[PDB]
Design a protein around this ligand. Structure first.
Ligand SMILES: NS(=O)(=O)Oc1ccc(NC(=O)Nc2ccc(Cl)c(C(F)(F)F)c2)cc1
Ligand SMILES: [Zn+2]
Length: 257
């Protein structure tokens, strides 16, 4: 039963999930001197319908904000893609202190947290479950979160956490467009990689934003005050859930800028 503690964490994942040591693993350190600018990359186009927001849930190691994905009301297009990708979820990763919480890094610099906006290829596949193990199945936008000014756009999300404090609690979460969380520039890096936790499928085209967004030290504390235990058990704060960076193994990170 995988997690982020010393016994079940990222260094132990390879035992039940050998793909952990694979050739398209994520996250990575983006070295800007080694990126290749690609003129064939189109701008990123997001069009999300706030009516597709459904539910927020505490999953023990993190929390997820899920979207209705029965149709193309909320889609990602452009960049490296020929196909439309359908929004299904956003979530975050964070660390035990402000110094290190992001998953991706840029020129060795660790940020305080990271936003993942996840999508599946509904042009080619019939469901998320089908798309999840396909090399071209998933598209994730990653946004680096730099500790600084409180981010007001995060506040509906953070305000919802009090209703999902312990593992398995879920609550309705509606009328929210997650494009409001994205930076104003959508200049990006792209590379072929993986889910950053088990089952670690190498099915993700990553879109990493060049511009960070802000988060306050107190907003980060709200993440870390979520509880990994079930109600009635001893409180176990969700202190961190970020994977270390993984070897590029010859992959090319492309820049849109
Ligand atoms: N961290 S990451 O890099 O963005 O990766 C993830 C992307 C989405 C999730 N969402 C879940 O609720 N869990 C979840 C669990 C297993 C699988 Cl197979 C998937 C799927 F997306 F592949 F289908 C999603 C979990 C991890
Ligand atoms: Zn993630």
């Amino acid at each position: 039963d995988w997690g982020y503690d010393d016994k079940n964490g990222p260094e132990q994942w390879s035992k039940l999930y050998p793909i952990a040591n694979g050739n398209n693993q994520s996250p990575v350190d983006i070295k800007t001197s080694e990126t290749k600018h690609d003129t064939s990359l189109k701008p990123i186009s997001v069009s999300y319908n706030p009516a597709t927001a459904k539910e927020i849930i505490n999953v023990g190691h993190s929390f997820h904000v899920n979207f209705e994905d029965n149709d193309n009301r909320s889609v990602l297009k452009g960049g490296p893609f020929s196909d439309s990708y359908r929004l299904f979820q956003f979530h975050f990763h964070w660390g035990s202190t402000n110094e290190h919480g992001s998953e991706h890094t840029v020129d060795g610099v660790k940020y305080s947290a990271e936003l993942h906006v996840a999508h599946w290829n509904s042009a080619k596949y019939s469901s998320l479950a089908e798309a999840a193990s396909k090399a071209d199945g998933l598209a994730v936008i990653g946004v680096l979160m730099k500790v600084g000014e409180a981010n007001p756009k995060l506040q509906k999300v953070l305000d919802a956490l009090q209703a999902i404090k312990t593992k398995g609690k879920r609550a309705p979460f509606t009328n929210f467009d997650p494009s409001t969380l994205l930076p104003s520039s959508l200049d990006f890096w792209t590379y072929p990689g993986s889910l950053t936790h088990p089952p670690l499928y190498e099915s993700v085209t990553w879109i990493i934003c060049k511009e960070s967004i802000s988060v306050s030290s107190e907003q980060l504390a709200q993440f870390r005050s979520l509880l990994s235990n079930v109600e009635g058990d001893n409180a176990v704060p969700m202190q961190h859930n970020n994977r270390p960076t993984q070897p590029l193994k010859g992959r090319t990170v492309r820049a849109s800028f």
